[PDB]
Amino acid sequence: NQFYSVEVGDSTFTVLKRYQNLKPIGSGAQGIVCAAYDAVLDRNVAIKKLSRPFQNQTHAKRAYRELVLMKCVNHKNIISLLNVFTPQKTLEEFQDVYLVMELMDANLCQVIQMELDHERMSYLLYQMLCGIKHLHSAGIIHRDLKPSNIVVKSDCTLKILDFGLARFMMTPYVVTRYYRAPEVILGMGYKENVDIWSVGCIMGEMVRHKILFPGRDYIDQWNKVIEQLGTPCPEFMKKLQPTVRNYVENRPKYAGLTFPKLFPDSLFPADSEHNKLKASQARDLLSKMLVIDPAKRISVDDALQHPYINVWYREHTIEEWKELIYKEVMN
Numbered sequence: 316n317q318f319y320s321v322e323v324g325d326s327t328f329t330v331l332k333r334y335q336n337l338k339p340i341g342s343g344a345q346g347i348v349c350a351a352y353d354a355v356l357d358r359n360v361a362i363k364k365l366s367r368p369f370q371n372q373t374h375a376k377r378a379y380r381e382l383v384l385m386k387c388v389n390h391k392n393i394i395s396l397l398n399v400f401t402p403q404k405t406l407e408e409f410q411d412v413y414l415v416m417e418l419m420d421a422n423l424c425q426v427i428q429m430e431l432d433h434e435r436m437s438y439l440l441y442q443m444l445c446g447i448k449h450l451h452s453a454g455i456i457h458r459d460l461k462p463s464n465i466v467v468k469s470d471c472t473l474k475i476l477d478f479g480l481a482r483f484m485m486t487p488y489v490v491t492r493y494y495r496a497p498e499v500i501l502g503m504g505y506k507e508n509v510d511i512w513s514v515g516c517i518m519g520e521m522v523r524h525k526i527l528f529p530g531r532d533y534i535d536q537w538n539k540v541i542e543q544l545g546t547p548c549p550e551f552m553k554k555l556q557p558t559v560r561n562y563v564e565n566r567p568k569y570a571g572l573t574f575p576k577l578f579p580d581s582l583f584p585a586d587s588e589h590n591k592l593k594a595s596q597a598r599d600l601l602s603k604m605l606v607i608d609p610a611k612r613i614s615v616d617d618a619l620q621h622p623y624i625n626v627w628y629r630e631h632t633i634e635e636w637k638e639l640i641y642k643e644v645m646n
């Protein structure tokens with residue numbers, strides 16, 4: 316037998332014998348994740364368990380798409396897999412999928428908590444931006460970039476771990492919507508620069524150490540957007556479908572704040588001329604990314620040109636989903 320079973324968390328990991336010394340890394344919406352030693356490569360790996368991915372269409376659509384897109388994508392800032400396996404011997408038996416990647420060290424969340432540094436922040440934004448340009452080039456608009464699904468290594472190398480949305484489950488686990496663009500909040504149709512808003516959000520949070528646009532749901536979240544950035548002006552409303560337009564036009568109006576008050580110089584270092592300049596460039600980039608109207612928001616190409624950044628330059632049953640996924644594993 317080429318697998319063995321072991322009781323991490325309150326889960327069972329049945330993994331190939333090559334992977335030893337399993338220890339819990341963490342848990343998202345998608346699966347349980349363990350650190351392990353890989354004896355064949357003689358290095359450290361992370362292994363994610365997907366328990367019955369085909370249990371509903373959401374879990375299943377996602378699982379299938381992330382397996383196909385991983386194989387077929389290739390960039391240093393986007394997950395790539397070392398290995399994919401199931402311990403189960405037949406389609407009839409099939410239950411769980413295991414995905415193996417090189418071990419990364421931290422979440423972006425833990426990085427956003429660290430004091431502001433211009434070399435690090437710019438290099439991370441550069442990488443998030445090159446990753447996204449890679450996704451957009453391959454036909455992939457993410458639409459749900461959030462720091463929980465972005466990982467980094469001690470040497471500041473960065474990878475995006477998921478491919479976002481395509482196009483309900485009875486589970487109390489709640490999705491993070493804080494980084495979603497206005498055109499996602501308001502159901503508006505979108506293009507590539509939808510992902511710039513989310514990078515803007517992570518960047519603002521790195522400076523402010525507070526989620527910019529929190530809320531119980533999109534009602535709250537929209538209030539937070541308008542009262543800091545102000546009510547969008549007239550000609551953005553005109554691309555809002557009739558019902559959304561009514562609601563957006565009837566919230567209490569806000570002037571909005573200038574970026575200097577939104578991100579005071581007090582949040583940055585001012586100990587050198589270099590840091591003074593980097594501070595005004597950072598805020599200039601934020602001001603170009605946290606733009607409600609996507610027609611006026613900066614593109615991914617313009618952002619990787621910005622001087623803060625450029626120093627670095629579809630309907631199946633669950634029986635049918637089970638097979639599709641099993642096939643792509645074995646293949």
Ligand SMILES: N#Cc1c(NC(=O)c2cccc3ccccc23)sc2c1CCN(C(=O)CCN1CCCCC1)C2
Nearest residue numbers: 340341348361362363414415416418419420421422476
């Ligand atoms: N390395 C790594 C790694 C992840 N990887 C995966 O999610 C993952 C592993 C294998 C294959 C995968 C395939 C597709 C998506 C994700 C995949 S997820 C994750 C990491 C490493 C840093 N992480 C942590 O949250 C660790 C630090 N936490 C601090 C807060 C309390 C708990 C400990 C999150």
